[PDB]
Amino acid sequence: DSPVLQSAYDPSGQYLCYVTVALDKQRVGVQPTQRATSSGVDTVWNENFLYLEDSKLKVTCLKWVNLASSDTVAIILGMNNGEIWLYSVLANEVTYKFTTGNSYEIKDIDLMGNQLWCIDSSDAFYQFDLLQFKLLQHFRINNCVQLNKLTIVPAGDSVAQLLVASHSISLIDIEEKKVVMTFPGHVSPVSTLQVITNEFFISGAEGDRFLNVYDIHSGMTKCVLVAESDIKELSHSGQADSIAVTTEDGSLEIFVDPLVGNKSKKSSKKIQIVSKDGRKVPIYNAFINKDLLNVSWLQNATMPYFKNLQWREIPNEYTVEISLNWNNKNKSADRDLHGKDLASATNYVE
Amino acid sequence: KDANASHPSHSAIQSLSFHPSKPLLLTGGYDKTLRIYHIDGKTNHLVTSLHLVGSPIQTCTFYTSLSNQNQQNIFTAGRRRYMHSWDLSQTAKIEKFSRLYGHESTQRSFENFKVAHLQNSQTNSVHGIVLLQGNNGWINILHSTSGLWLMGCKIEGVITDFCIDYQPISRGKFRTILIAVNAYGEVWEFDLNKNGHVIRRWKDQGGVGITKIQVGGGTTTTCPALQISKI
Amino acid sequence: AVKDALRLVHLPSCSVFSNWPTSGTPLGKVTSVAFSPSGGLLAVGNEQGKVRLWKLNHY
Amino acid sequence: MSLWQLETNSQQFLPRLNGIIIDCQVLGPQGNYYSLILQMTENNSNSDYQFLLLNASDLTSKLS
Amino acid sequence: NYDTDFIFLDIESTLGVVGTSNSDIFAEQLHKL
Amino acid sequence: QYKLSVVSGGKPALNNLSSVTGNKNIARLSQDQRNYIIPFNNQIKVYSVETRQCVKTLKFANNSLLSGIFLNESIVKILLGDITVAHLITVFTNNGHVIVLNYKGKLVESPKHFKISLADEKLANVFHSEGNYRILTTFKNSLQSYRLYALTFDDAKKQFEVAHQAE
Amino acid sequence: LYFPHISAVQIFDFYKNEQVNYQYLTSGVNNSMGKVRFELNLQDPIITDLKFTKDGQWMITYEIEYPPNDLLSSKDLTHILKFWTKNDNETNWNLKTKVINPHGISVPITKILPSPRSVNNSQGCLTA
Amino acid sequence: STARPRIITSKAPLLPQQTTPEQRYWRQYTSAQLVKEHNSVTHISFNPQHPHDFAVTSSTRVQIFSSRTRQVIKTFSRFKDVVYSASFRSDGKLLCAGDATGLVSVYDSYNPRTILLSINASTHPTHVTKFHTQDNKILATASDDRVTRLWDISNAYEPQLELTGATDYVRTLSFIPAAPHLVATGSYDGLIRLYDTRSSGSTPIYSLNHDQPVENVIAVSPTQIVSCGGNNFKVWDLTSNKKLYERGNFNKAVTCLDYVENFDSPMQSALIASSLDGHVKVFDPLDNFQVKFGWKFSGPVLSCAVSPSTAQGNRHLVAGLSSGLLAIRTKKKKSNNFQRMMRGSEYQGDQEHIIHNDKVRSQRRMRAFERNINQFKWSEALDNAFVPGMAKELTLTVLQELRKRGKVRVALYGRDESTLEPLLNWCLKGIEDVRSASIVADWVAVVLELYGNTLESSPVLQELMIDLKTKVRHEIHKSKEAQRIEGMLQLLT
RNA sequence: UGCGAAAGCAGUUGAAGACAAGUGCUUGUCGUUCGUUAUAAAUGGCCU
Ligand SMILES: [Mg+2]
């Protein structure tokens, strides 16, 4: 129902990467979310794109390599071939291609510094080093019959344990190569497994209106966050200060201090976009850092637009109003209202 | 998924065209509308629409200049005495061609036309030509941008259809050959790079009531080139 | 002239394709046809105002 | 303004300009624009020039 | 003129008036393209 | 209390030479063909063709060099870009001053002012095809005579040198 | 800023320093044809005076039409006076009334003075 | 570039008694049919509802005329002696009429056979019988008994109220809109008596003095009532109880009066007043009741009426004459497979993003003479000037345009006596009128200067100049007279 | 051309040089000058 198959903000929240299909081929592009740069030069549409030369080929998971950490701004793309590509946006070319020996599609990827992790349809974990460009080890854990998601816990500066998800969620240690804890997940496959803070990671599943907040150390559901309609995309602010969920029906909901009756909490601020005429525009991604919330919606067919708003002052239910062309009388700059050429002198009529 | 599900057409789809590079499709009809769709194959939403009051749409096509690839434009025509051109979003830059420069007699409707690339050999510059169908065997050739009348070509009997062919000569050189056919079946072949002079004549064996003529296997309106070496 | 009046021809064999179109394929009165420059998409319009889109797997 | 077609010696016209045409030119790689200078000889006290830039496509004032 | 100032016209037809960070580089490279 | 200041513009400037015809226009259209530069008597206006509005005005009064030079001298030509070297223009006036200005921005208070060497010659026209520059100039029955020099900018001396070609 | 050009009025915006309009306020061969050779000797009507009421909705014009040469009626100038009106949004003045030969025949209207705001709410004028 | 100016038709300064927008609308009551009736038509009324057929009382019969057909469609002849009114009820279903015998009969309109209610109002004649506008049930009756009984359709045996106090014949009853309680009656005493039905009644609330016998009283608006009596009609205001206006343009005694408001005319409201001098004239209530139009008829006019506001079709002006003549004036008011092949023309782009229109509006076709001026056919433009059935004003232009263009001699070079005669023949006629006198003076001089020699050898032209010389001389005498009058006036002032 | 009203009241249209044509002479011309306030006529008519 949306032309944008997969989307992802950068860590800073300035640049959005989205993948869409042109005829039978997918194309990947990166565009500047902010209206104007720090230098004051207006941002412009980026026509440069990366085209996948094969129709069969598809992008399954996209991940930003942090802009500050690495000299070259890069985005890592997992592909259904079973190989991972490193994409540097400036050169508009894939710099290096990480290939696993097997051919199964990558279901999730996640990154910390040099450590790069991926999981296949064959339920095998893998490791990769960005600098050395090598496959370090690959192992299969028992009692992991599917792995729809992967997230590496933010512990120190090294990866000591990983969060992986199927209909149920699991925590695994790299060194012992065995599960540590098991959490009761959702009935449907898990869609989002982002880690809000220490000992608190949230979970959501396809075709579900609820998010479970799980404690890593203990394992009890701290809270169940509720959406008005299904959940598609997730973004958290700071450290559990606020959470933004992109609902499937096209609305953005904001949870305020969700980590503070108590068990099941509902979204406090709901955001929607409606054009002047009356048509509603769905939202397909969002980002919320401290007090600025970024809303991205599609105009034309795949032209993405952006808006920045301060959610603190916004009332509970707020609908942005946007000018979209509709029965717009076309006014050419070289004619007046009656079609006469502007240079022409008006004639004398008694 | 059908392309028109996103926004239906209220009249027949009189012409279709795929943009040379971008993934866009243009439709027109006697509804007097120009609908452009973004064909993905799964959603096919509507990029834009443009209503041309009192200009029934009989044929449409995208045009990308062979030198300045940034140039994009849409030519549309009908059973009317004027042709529209839309350069490529608050407003639309639409230009109306309604001057034939002394040949208004031969051309009383633009409803049939095609667009091709002409290389002015003495200068080696390449521009667009809009080709038209006259009254009695007359083919009018206009400059695409300025609208100037460049040359005219004539055949015997009622002109029914015509098609454009390119013949490379050397690195950076190519000649435009205009193929026209009569209702009975004579085929002419003008060389538009030498003032519209016939170069060959033949007959389509067993041709009677010819209706449309087309060429393929190389460059043409449906498979345009993007640089001179691709002709 | 008549509904479903469309055929595809292989070249240079000049042998018309037999599997497609079929009796059940929707074409109506085919009144406009367009091939995509790449990807082998085929868009066929009809008098009803519908542009039905097909894909050629070979391209 | 008269455009003489020299192939067949025909002509096309752009009449009723605001003044007499002191100058004409074709300004563009493909003759996109015609640049004109007008005089408005009515005002005999002063020389009242007006510069026009016309779009060759439809002969309409792109910039006056 | 009806506000305080006065306008005057010169034979040169001149109406005078008498009156009382890696992200920042990335933004630049993106704009250049 | 009261003060005097110029506000509006004035008549467009022209190549007021009887001999030259078809060259009376000195305005130019940018290389990208998105804006038209028209020199007036007291300023230079840059109009955007797409919007038909005056995007920029370069007034002679504001800048110091222009005020001294023009405020009698007139622009005999405008050349897009800069000869010595993307929004630069070079203005040649009849006496011989060559000034390198910029539109689409804020005018720089020290343009790369130069001065061609002419001996009792009034510069009439300048023109180029590809890095080659020729200048036509008038010297003195009431009929003026013309001379054609070849103009080149030498980087070492940063001066415009003129070599005689025709008379 | 309104300029009484020969047979026309040119409306110019000096805040923006551009022309906004150019309207022909007389009859005569103005733009119907291009005068050439002898026709060039013809003199179009000349707008001698142009003034506005204080309220600013009414435009008064005074015009002199010059007869052609070498006819019997080649020495009887025609003095015309016209009243126009427009709304603020509109850009073209519309002629509302026309007086032919005010004050008598061949007697000039040297001066026009729009009335002050007190009398008829600025909807009047004096001619001398 | 600019589109060519359209040649401006000449307009000489406005002369007195110009056509006014009020007159232009009322002159469209063109089609006139005169019908003859046995006796004087006394009263005329219009059905308030569609199709608004109007009833006319004459002799012993009432006739209903169709609005579209303008012919009798129903006839009520049951009345034994003369009939005196045909007012409809507000709904338009019923029709009430009076008799000399005094009985009041209520018939179902459009069913003359059926009689619904018969009332013996009084032994004296019953001249006025009107239904109440606000309330349907109550019916009013006026008699020469000088009592205006207020009847009720449900109870006919006794009157609901019996207003009295008039010392002369009562022939006029009016009900004031928006004040249903109030009732207004006028007698030949010269007093208009106003009564309140809510109170006990039988004694007027107050009397307005009209000073002449009152022939009809009409309530123009909720606060104004206009009464026509004697040689004038005076409009009264009840709140102040004094006359705002009076008009005495009429000569004979006004007889009837009718009012209509909110119809498609330039004038919002119209007051038509019969004269008995053969006149029925229109007055404008928004303009202090000033005249705007009038018609003259063969004999005295005894009744007037105009179609109601919601006519919904051709309007009618009806007048009644004592001779029995009735005058009516009227203001008249492929294959499916093909269609599917072209179904888009109806669309107006309501669902589209951008609407772009460039078609130039169609201008009126330009006449032949304008075509010749525009193409610089000077001589032909002169010929087209003098053609049979050419309106005088248009001809005067093409002479003026050519003079303004400076092409007078150019238009007269290639001419002989055969083709010069039309110009002189017009000039022979143009010289009379004040507007073209100056222009003809100009052209006539040129042809003499340019065809002196030709004139000598052609005898026909010589006569044209003698006849011309006669009439120009006659014009001098008229102008000289006008000067003497003008001097004569200055002496008086 | 000056003044004035629009009407008018006064006043001008000189000299040199050069070229062309006809036959040193005659006439006509000036993208030549000095001085005084100081017929036309290359078949040649305006878009969609
Ligand atoms: Mg069938």
- Rounded CA-CA distance G86/F6 in Å is 31
Q: Which residues contact H487 (CB under 8 A, 6 or more apart)?
A: none
Written as six digits, the tokens of D7 are: 């192939």
How many residues are given for chain C?
59
Picking from A284, A281, A279, A286, the residue whose alpha carbon sits closest to that of residue A326 is: A279
Which nucleotides of strand I lie within 7 A of protein CB? 6-8, 31-33, 40, 45-48
Give the bridge partners for A270, in sequence order.
A253, A317
User: CB–CB of B74/B34 below 8 Å?
Assistant: yes
Strand partners, D40: none
Distance C56 CA to ligand 1 centre (A): 26
> Does strand I come within 7 Å of the CB of B40?
no
Contact B144, B95 (CB under 8 A): no
Neighbours of chain D (3+ CB pairs under 8 A): A, B, F, G, H
Please spell the DSSP secondary structure of A308-337, one letter per residue: EEETTTS-SEEEEEE---SSEE---TTB-T
Instruction: Return the number of other C-beta atoms located less than 10 Å from residue G119's C-beta.
Output: 9
Rounded (10°) CA dihedral H308, H310, H312, H316? 20
- 3-class DSSP state of A143: coil
Q: Which of F110, F92, F102 is nearest to F151 (CA)?
A: F92
Name the nearest CA neighbour of A201 among A181, A229, A230: A181
Contact B75, B85 (CB under 8 A): yes
CA distance F167 to G11: 48
Gap between the Cα atoms of A278 and A283, Å rounded: 16
CA separation for the pair H464, D59 (Å, rounded): 53
Q: Helices marked H in B11-169 — which ranges?
A: none
The spacing between the Cα labelled CA in H228 and the C1' in I21, in angstroms, equals: 101
Question: What resolution in Å is listed for this PDB structure?
Answer: 3.7
Measured CA to CA in angstroms, residue H422 lies from A63, A341, H479 at distances of 96, 43, 26
Are E20 and F1 an interchain contact pair (Cβ–Cβ within 8 Å)? yes
User: Which residue's structure tokens are 């074409």?
Assistant: C27
Closest nucleotide to residue B102 (Cα to C1')?
I47
Other beta carbons less than 10 A from residue H109's beta carbon:
22
Surface of B (185-224) touching C: CB under 8 A: 222-224
Residue H239 corresponds to which tokens in the numbers above? 């709140």
What's the CA dihedral at F89, F91, F96, F97 to 10 degrees?
-80
End-to-end CA distance of chain E: 50
Cβ contact G94 with chain I strand, < 7 A:
no
Residue D13 CB in 7 A reach of strand I: yes
Helix (H) or strand (E) segment spanning residue G32: none
Residues 104-143 of F with CB under 7 A from strand I: 141-143
The residues with which B131 forms a beta bridge, in sequence order, are: B114, B141
Contact (CB<8Å) D14/H2: no
User: Across the interface, do B12 and C46 touch by the CB < 8 Å criterion?
Assistant: yes
| Ligand 1 center from residue C2 Cα (angstroms) | 9
A55·C39 Cβ contact <8 A: yes
Q: Which of H422, H371, H399, H381 is nearest to H9 (CA)?
A: H399
Question: What sign does the CA torsion over A139, A140, A142, A144 have?
Answer: positive
**Sheet holding G2-5: strands in order across?**
G2-5, G8-13, G18-24
Is the separation of the CB atoms in A335 and A62 below 8 Å?
Answer: no
φ and ψ of H311, to 5 deg: -65, -40
- d(CA A252, CA G16) in angstroms, rounded, equals 45
Half-sphere exposure of D53 (CA within 13 A, CB side): 23
State how far the Cα of H42 lies from the Cα of B159, in Å rounded to an integer. Answer: 81
* H329 within 8 A of H70, measured Cβ to Cβ: no
Whole-number Å distance between alpha carbons of A303 and A20 = 11
- Look up residue H360 and give its DSSP letter: P
Alpha-carbon span B46 to H11, nearest angstrom:
57
Whether H345 contacts chain B with CB within 8 A: yes
Do the chains contact at A41 and E23, CB–CB below 8 Å? no
Grouping H, G, I as helix, E, B as strand and the rest as coil, residue A110 is: strand
Q: Which residues is F129 bridged to in the sheet?
A: none
Strand order, beta sheet including A115-120:
A106-112, A115-120, A125-129, A134-139
- Between the two ends of chain A, the Cα-to-Cα distance in Å is 60
Exposed / middle / buried, residue A146 (Cβ in 10 Å: 0-12, 13-18, 19+): middle
Give the nucleotide nearest to D12 (CA→C1'). I47
Contacts A346 to G, Cβ<8 Å? 21-24, 92
Half-sphere exposure of B170 (CA within 13 A, CB side): 2
Which nucleotide is closest to the Cα of H374 by its C1'? I46
Buried (b) or exposed (e) across H219-234, using 16+ Cβ within 10 A? bbbeebbbbbbbbbbb
Query: What is the bridge-based pairing of β-strands A317-322 and A269-275?
Result: parallel
Residue F48 three-state SS: strand
Distance D44 CA to I37 C1' (A): 21
